[PDB]
Amino acid sequence: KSPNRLVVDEAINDDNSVVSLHPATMEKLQLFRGDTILIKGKKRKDTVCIALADETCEEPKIRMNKVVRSNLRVRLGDVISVHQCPDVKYGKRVHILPVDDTVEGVTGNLFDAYLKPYFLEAYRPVRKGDLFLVRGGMRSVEFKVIETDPAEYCVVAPDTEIFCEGEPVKREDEERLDDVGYDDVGGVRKQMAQIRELVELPLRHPQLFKSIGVKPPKGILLYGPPGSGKTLIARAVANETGAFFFCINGPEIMSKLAGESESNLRKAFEEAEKNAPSIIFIDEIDSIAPKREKTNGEVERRIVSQLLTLMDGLKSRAHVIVMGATNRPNSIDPALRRFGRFDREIDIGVPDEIGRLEVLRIHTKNMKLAEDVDLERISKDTHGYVGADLAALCTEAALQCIREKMDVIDLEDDSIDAEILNSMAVTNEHFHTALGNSNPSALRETVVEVPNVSWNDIGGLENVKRELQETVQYPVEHPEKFEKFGMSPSKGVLFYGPPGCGKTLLAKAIANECQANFISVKGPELLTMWFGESEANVREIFDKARQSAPCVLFFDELDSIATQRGGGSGGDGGGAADRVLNQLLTEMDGMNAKKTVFIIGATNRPDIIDSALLRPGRLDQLIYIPLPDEDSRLNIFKAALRKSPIAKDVDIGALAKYTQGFSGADITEICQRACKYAIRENIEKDIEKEKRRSENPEAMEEDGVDEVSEIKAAHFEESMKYARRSVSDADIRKYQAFAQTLQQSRGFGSEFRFE
Amino acid sequence: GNLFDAYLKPYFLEAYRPVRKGDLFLVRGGMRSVEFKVIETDPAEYCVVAPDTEIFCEGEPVKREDEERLDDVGYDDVGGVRKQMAQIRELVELPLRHPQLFKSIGVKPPKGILLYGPPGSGKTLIARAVANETGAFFFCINGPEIMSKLAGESESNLRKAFEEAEKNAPSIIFIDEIDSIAPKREKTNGEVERRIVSQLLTLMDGLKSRAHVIVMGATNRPNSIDPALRRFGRFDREIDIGVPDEIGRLEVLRIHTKNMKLAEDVDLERISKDTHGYVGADLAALCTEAALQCIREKMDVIDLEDDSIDAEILNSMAVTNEHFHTALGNSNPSALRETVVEVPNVSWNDIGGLENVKRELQETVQYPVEHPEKFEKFGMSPSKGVLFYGPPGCGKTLLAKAIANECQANFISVKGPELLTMWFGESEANVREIFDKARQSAPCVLFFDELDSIATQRGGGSGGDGGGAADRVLNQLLTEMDGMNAKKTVFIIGATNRPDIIDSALLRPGRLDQLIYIPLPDEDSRLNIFKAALRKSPIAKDVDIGALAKYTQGFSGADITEICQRACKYAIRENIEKDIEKEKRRSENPEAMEEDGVDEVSEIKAAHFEESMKYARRSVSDADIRKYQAFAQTLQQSRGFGSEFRFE
Ligand SMILES: Nc1ncnc2c1ncn2[C@@H]1O[C@H](COP(=O)(O)OP(=O)(O)O)[C@@H](O)[C@H]1O
Ligand SMILES: Nc1ncnc2c1ncn2[C@@H]1O[C@H](COP(=O)(O)OP(=O)(O)O)[C@@H](O)[C@H]1O
Ligand SMILES: Nc1ncnc2c1ncn2[C@@H]1O[C@H](COP(=O)(O)OP(=O)(O)O)[C@@H](O)[C@H]1O
Ligand SMILES: Nc1ncnc2c1ncn2[C@@H]1O[C@H](COP(=O)(O)OP(=O)(O)O)[C@@H](O)[C@H]1O
């Protein structure tokens, strides 16, 4: 294996003529940064590129994009040869023609529309016969290079002539460059990695499994909310590995007559086996094999059995992978997930803020977004949006831009000029309107997130922070030393104290600091899961916690369900609170084996909490969160005002001294009322602009920077007029009569000295 | 490749294995097994392999003769089911190994066997092993395949199978997934659904006389099928293939890694301890994932490609502990909710004190079962109901586990929340199922914990006046305990923390009528508990323990364990801070020397114990002790009766 032989890799930058290598890789071949490098591919193909040094890449791997790989007829992870050749010289004339399959409906000067920005200031190497993709005008166009002066390869220069006259060329056997790839899917990085590591061996190296004799995975079930992108992921995996893709739709198979439905699956399996390696995607598999409780027999029980038979009908491996897709794991019957039929399961959940931003950037790559568009704000605003909703939002923004452009020009005809299409810019107003018009679809889904709260957002509670670190961070980040002492740490924490003191913030901060997933569940949410209880849902939550390890499972508002039976709980009819409490106890007893899931509970009435929760193996550790002291009150005031442009004539310290018995929520409410007063004052000052000009039309422009109207001492004094304490004095002593009994430290202070 | 150095060189290394011309042998390696057939040898027919003996191997592979495959399932390919394997072997040894004897004796042999357990537990594996190791003919019937086909064809397939099996007697018919063919009669689906099952029943009676044919069913739950299948003659035998225990899981892991070259650092015992709720299929998948991870790591550095990997390359792959750890972390169990019938590892030495309770438990439990021939001599039947009461966290569950282990009896643990969680639209059979699982596992100890949730008195000391959940379960428990007295080898032990509010229906004779009070440990027992909790922790030499026991008054065993846990956490923090010094010093001075002179143990010192004792909390108030004493004395009647009864 010569040093000039490497393994291709996917690149972060999507430039069509840029290849990234580590400096150590280039040192072995005398390659320098910014040079011109030839790469040889398969089936007698080759390309020319330029090199950039990136330290993130590794020596064995070379980074390229999809277009270069398509030109080289190679796939990801394949082996290529890299050579250097200084014969690449400046060319005089290069003749390029577009592809007929992509230029339908657009007629005009494609030169200034696409090629002029494409070759502007970039010395992109060009080889005769290759193809490249240009994105613009809300579409993508394939251009195939026809001729060039310097033999086969050349460098485009400002003085180089670019010939483009001629009819569009006809597509050859080369694959489409607009098909789905790994760059067309966003927010599913972990699941994408799992699927890639599951399917890399059976697909990229099939014959190896004839030699080793180990059975590769066969059945994969993807589940998630509709529109989350299961089919997109399947198609991307199939395309980027070069596999043959056969798509089976559940409605189509089920709709057809009996016997035909059984024959279609057999034909599909036969074709996939004959065209191995291949991927069979059974879209919407829930319709074919529903749960056995349906009690509908005859034909309903035939095909599913046949399906099971045909799942076992694959007598031996044939480089064939079946990929199911449903909405809920419990929707299908258990017999489908036996050993050999469907062994692998992946959850494609609703994306988070970063995933939503990635999807938005994916769906706007053909659009010319204006400079004022802020996709980060849109990603923050869209909560409960699946990728389909984001795609629809982008389409609506594009359509609004098209409507605004057509409002002023009556283009009509049959083909819009390419320059006109490229001149359309989508602004922030279109996105705002489309976002306001649209509605989410995955609001009720349990979100598994990594919170943004850190320790710096919490005012005080330093001892609680230290105890939480010792309790949570060490068992997971440093597990190799806990086993040395032979003592297994407890995984149950219960925060108790006055309401609005920072228990949820502490849970989010400890989840974020350990870089662990966070799941938040409330008592009303547990009770709302139908009073004709579907008792599996609670278990589902723990299941979602089990596959997301490491994770922090936070239960809030336990006082609604976790009250003692009869002694301190209303509703003696029962069946709702007691049932959920028993299910929680059983799940917490059964969760001890995961070793990486921490359960945190919060309550505001620790005296009436059920004693069954405090037993070992359950939330047996108790932490008391008190009202913040004056230093912590100063910290909370500073934290609440981290963004508000507060005026310089402020004290804050006397605010902390004055606010006794006020919780953090009360401080936040005081700041909110001060902000409202400042808003009112700013509005009244803005009204002066209209009033003065109405009283005198000859008034001059007074728009000398907008009046900030900072939070001044007057606003704070007005807000403090009705500042209400949320906790009475009796609450503090009630909590103290539980903390001291749960500490046993008033009489044990430095009184145990032994040698 | 060079199969010689790959397989034969280690096979004949230092072993003087006799070799006969014409035989075959199996060599395991490279994640596979290879059959080698001996062709020739110099000393006539038999010879002894020696280091100076030439080994010729050049030539094409031979073609398989009528000899059976050596990779087929056998008794060594099944693990963790030793008792059930013995039962099946003793049930099928006579009809299969000695068939014609049943034409002479005239006694009807067993015909129908139903194996049940969680999916993936290994029912088909057991059936195939039994069929192969007895030389019987094996016909496999799959429920989905029979049910899927059209009407009339489904009835004809069973008839053809029975005809073929009878014509090729002795034989075993395995009806895999029999639950689909004959579900419970409550399905209320008629016509075809009622045809085949009836036909099945007919074909179960269609075997007019014995024909050296054994039918072997396989379902998931005994109550899933209709009762008419288990009539006299159709399906008379039933075996439960439950989820394996730690030893069974270790056996399965060793079974599935016999073709793999495990590295020296692999500790399968830790994996067996870690995997809880894993059926054999899950363990097989885990081993396959570890092997695949090893293959990926090996392919990461070499681009072998071609079409056939060299045998030496395959044999060079070693599976390490990191691969097993990663695969175990990735995998998830499948039998978590199954009732586990285990033999606990707790012994008397793990319990601090309670010597009188240990003696009473021995007299109550061990003697009636280990020495039953002398109880009948006196003519008095011992009671089988014990109720532990006392403060929480004092060792009632430990006592139950220890008494189960000392008698070498199975242990089943059930909690009140588990009983209530069995749907509030109660499937009332589940409680009975537990007792049924106790009945077939005799001798067994059935331990009920946290009875205070369901066993409170009706109305007087129980919340939720709507009813239907706690009272129903209490009535079912009373009925089952009344009906359990006939087994003579099942002991029911209950534990509660509020004996004053317990229902008086439980204390009647024939039920948990014996009461034992477990008190807070005394100072000697506190010393014993401190010693037991620290049996593995490397405690420092500057410790007293005795003054710890003296100081901890009103602290339960759980409190002592929590104190030790907090001390361990403090030691962990100190060790982490000391480890950070290795990075800090080298960052402040890159020319620092290697200070890795054995890892700092950071033993539990007096400072850690003193820090932990700062917030050491008593879990029981002083009122709890007197509340329990106001029940113990009334349940003992011994304050006024001490050595006051002297008669001759
Ligand atoms: N994670 C994602 N990234 C980018 N696009 C997505 C994503 N999820 C869904 N989409 C878009 O949604 C459209 C249809 O979604 P689809 O995959 O059919 O839904 P389902 O997964 O329920 O079958 C696709 O055209 C795709 O562009
Ligand atoms: N110690 C604190 N530091 C910063 N913010 C706080 C603190 N305590 C309360 N807050 C504010 O109070 C609001 C709600 O408090 P929350 O944590 O929900 O109360 P609880 O602990 O009762 O759930 C949060 O938005 C948070 O900003
Ligand atoms: N006790 C066991 N020992 C060894 N392997 C087992 C055991 N139980 C299950 N397996 C493995 O599980 C695989 C399939 O299990 P199977 O017997 O088909 O499940 P079921 O019993 O539900 O039909 C078999 O290939 C076997 O190797
Ligand atoms: N006498 C004792 N000897 C040893 N350990 C004990 C003792 N009492 C309590 N423990 C410890 O307390 C923990 C839980 O006690 P447990 O037996 O569950 O209490 P309960 O009897 O209320 O069920 C166990 O892990 C055990 O190690």
Swiss-Prot record, chain A:
Residues engaged in binding ADP: G186, G224, P225, P226, G227, S228, G229, K230, T231, L232, H363
SMART domains named among the record's database cross-references: AAA, CDC48_2, CDC48_N
Record-linked PROSITE patterns: AAA
Keyword Phosphoprotein listed: yes
Keywords: Acetylation, ATP-binding, Cell cycle, Cell division, Cell membrane, Cytoplasm, Cytoskeleton, Membrane, Nucleotide-binding, Nucleus, Phosphoprotein, Protein transport, Repeat, Transport
Name of the featured protein: Cell division control protein 48 homolog A
Pfam families to which the protein is assigned, alphabetical: AAA, AAA_lid_3, CDC48_2, CDC48_N
Effect annotated for changing E557Q: Abolishes ATPase activity
Location in or out of the cell: Nucleus; Cytoplasm, Cytoskeleton, Phragmoplast; Cell membrane
Effect the entry attributes to changing E284Q: Decreases ATPase activity
Membrane topology of the entry: Peripheral membrane protein
GO molecular function, one term: identical protein binding
Sites of Phosphoserine modification: S17
Coiled coil stretches, renumbered: none
The family this protein is said to belong to: Belongs to the AAA ATPase family.
GO CC annotations, alphabetized: cytoplasm; cytosol; cytosolic ribosome; Golgi apparatus; lipid droplet; nuclear envelope; nucleolus; nucleus
Summary of subunit composition and partner proteins: Homohexamer. Interacts with SERK1, GRF6, KAPP and SYP31, but not with KNOLLE. Component of the SERK1 signaling complex, composed of KAPP, CDC48A, GRF6 or GRF7, SERK1, SERK2, SERK3/BAK1 and BRI1. Interacts with PUX1, PUX2, PUX3, PUX4, PUX5, PUX7 and PUX11 via its N-terminus.
GO BP: cell division; negative regulation of defense response; pollen germination; pollen tube growth; protein destabilization; protein transport
Binding-site list for ATP: G497, P498, P499, G500, C501, G502, K503, T504, L505
Record PTM: Phosphorylated on at least one threonine residue and on Ser-17 by SERK1.
Function: Probably functions in cell division and growth processes. Interacts with certain SNAREs as part of specialized membrane fusion events where vesicles from the same organelle fuse (homotypic fusion).
Swiss-Prot record, chain B:
Outcome, altering E450Q: Abolishes ATPase activity
Membrane topology of the entry: Peripheral membrane protein
Keyword entries, A-Z: Acetylation, ATP-binding, Cell cycle, Cell division, Cell membrane, Cytoplasm, Cytoskeleton, Membrane, Nucleotide-binding, Nucleus, Phosphoprotein, Protein transport, Repeat, Transport
Domain of life: Eukaryota
GO-annotated cellular components: cytoplasm; cytosol; cytosolic ribosome; Golgi apparatus; lipid droplet; nuclear envelope; nucleolus; nucleus
Binding site for ADP: G79, G117, P118, P119, G120, S121, G122, K123, T124, L125, H256
Subcellular location, record wording: Nucleus; Cytoplasm, Cytoskeleton, Phragmoplast; Cell membrane
Binding site for ATP: G390, P391, P392, G393, C394, G395, K396, T397, L398
GO biological process, one term: cell division
Phosphoprotein is among the record's keywords: yes
Molecular function as annotated in GO: ATP binding; ATP hydrolysis activity; identical protein binding
Family statement drawn from the similarity comment of this UniProt entry: Belongs to the AAA ATPase family.
Function: Probably functions in cell division and growth processes. Interacts with certain SNAREs as part of specialized membrane fusion events where vesicles from the same organelle fuse (homotypic fusion).
Self-association state and partner proteins as the record states: Homohexamer. Interacts with SERK1, GRF6, KAPP and SYP31, but not with KNOLLE. Component of the SERK1 signaling complex, composed of KAPP, CDC48A, GRF6 or GRF7, SERK1, SERK2, SERK3/BAK1 and BRI1. Interacts with PUX1, PUX2, PUX3, PUX4, PUX5, PUX7 and PUX11 via its N-terminus.
Entry protein name: Cell division control protein 48 homolog A
Source organism of this protein record: Arabidopsis thaliana
